[PDB]
Antibody
């Protein structure tokens, strides 16, 4: 019906530029103010910019003034955001939105990741245990997303928690995967995390051994 | 600008409950208040605009009321689809500003985190870097505070947290906090402690280890 279809975004280096697009259908595009709103990872919503129906009136958030430029092409039913001089703090899902009295139609979201990293496979380190014992693997310093982790080649699923990746200040991702198991099993069962980072073709199987030190 | 603060940060609800969320403005916004719903990995959706008006297609178990600086969103008979984050938003003045959100999640009993502390591997230490990981496992509700201490010094600015979505089987959360130190700094200190505050704990629990010790 009424729809806003986003494209653009993805990976960019600090200081670099990206252009986001938003294609509108199902309503009279030229008669509405359009907006961009962003959401940093694990955080709330921040308005970025607005543009009036005929581009007479343009508004920017304090945090993007002088770097981002909003525009629209009413004849193509399209909204744009030219983002320049990108920084780590601009890493976020960016949404286009129509405004009437509230933001009443939203795009699907476009992820923008600002990092100087090249493709790099992770190092995998043990998180070693010492009724129930917890063990895991730290999957550190990889780019881009994603990595997959299983345990015991998929035969161990119960009690597994693989955390969402966090972008570190180095521009590389890290995550841990953990599992809780009965401590009585630690002396008889083997626990192995299977890590695959397909962008770098990096596959590791790490058996996690109980430690005391 | 106009600061919007929502309360509580999370509400525990069961299927069929009535849920009431609160939003407060730092100054008067008249009727210019909207409410949105967000589910994991999805864009927000408008529910209510101008404080009380239902958007097209939105189910009539959602109502809003209030004006000035005080507003509420009521869900009158919660369905499985309504477990989500809810945001308010002021359209009185530019910049439009959002509240920080309220997560309506599945009610279960309070479960204290099982806390585990993991020293850096010797593998990693070889490379000049030390990651210390604190696991908070299978807890409820989601609100939890992790304080790192190194030789009793309260750490800030050098840890990162990551949290799971509510588990489908047991309705709990888990959280990792990771402290990142140079190998040099790690070698300069003895006691590495993870102190955890949570509703399921009568006073904060400290898990710790001593570098080099068994």
């Amino acid at each position: 019906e009424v729809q806003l279809v986003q494209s653009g975004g993805g990976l960019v280096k600090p200081g670099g530029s990206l252009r986001l697009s938003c294609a509108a259908s199902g309503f009279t595009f030229s008669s509405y103010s359009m907006n961009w709103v962003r959401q940093a990872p694990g955080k709330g919503l921040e308005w970025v910019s607005s543009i009036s129906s005929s581009s007479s009136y343009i508004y920017y958030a304090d945090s993007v003034k002088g770097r981002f430029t909003i525009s629209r092409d009413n004849a193509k039913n399209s909204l744009y955001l030219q983002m320049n001089s990108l920084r780590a703090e601009d890493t976020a899902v960016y949404y286009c939105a129509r405004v009437t009295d509230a933001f009443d139609i939203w795009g699907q979201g476009t992820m923008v990741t600002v990092s100087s990293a090249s493709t790099k496979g992770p190092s995998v380190f043990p998180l070693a245990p010492s009724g129930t014992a917890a063990l895991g693997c730290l999957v550190k310093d990889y780019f881009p997303e994603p990595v997959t982790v299983s345990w015991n080649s998929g035969a161990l699923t119960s009690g597994v928690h693989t955390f969402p990746a966090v972008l570190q200040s180095s521009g590389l991702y890290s995550l841990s995967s953990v599992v809780t198991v009965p401590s009585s099993s630690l002396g008889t069962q083997t626990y192995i995390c299977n890590v695959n980072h397909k962008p770098s073709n990096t596959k590791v199987d790490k058996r996690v051994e109980p430690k005391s030190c | 600008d106009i600061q919007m603060t929502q309360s509580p940060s999370s509400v525990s609800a069961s299927i069929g409950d009535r849920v009431t969320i609160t939003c407060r403005a730092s100054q008067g916004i008249d009727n210019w208040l909207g409410w949105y719903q967000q589910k994991p990995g999805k864009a927000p959706k408008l529910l209510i605009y101008d404080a009380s008006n239902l958007d097209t297609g939105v189910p009539s178990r959602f109502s809003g009321s209030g004006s000035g600086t005080y507003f509420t969103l009521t869900i009158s008979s919660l369905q499985a689809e309504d477990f989500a984050v809810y945001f308010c938003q002021q359209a009185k003045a530019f910049p439009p500003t959002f509240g920080g959100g309220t997560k309506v999640d599945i009610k279960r009993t309070v479960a204290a985190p099982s806390v585990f502390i993991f020293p850096p591997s010797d593998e990693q230490l070889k490379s000049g870097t030390a990651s210390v990981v604190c696991l908070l496992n299978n807890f409820y509700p989601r609100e939890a505070k992790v304080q790192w201490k190194v030789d009793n010094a309260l750490q800030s600015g050098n840890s990162q947290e990551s949290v799971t979505e509510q588990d489908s089987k047991d309705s709990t959360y888990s959280l990792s906090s990771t402290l990142t130190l140079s190998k040099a700094d790690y070698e300069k200190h003895k006691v590495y402690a993870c102190e955890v505050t949570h509703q399921g704990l009568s006073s904060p629990v400290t898990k710790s280890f001593n570098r080099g010790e068994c």
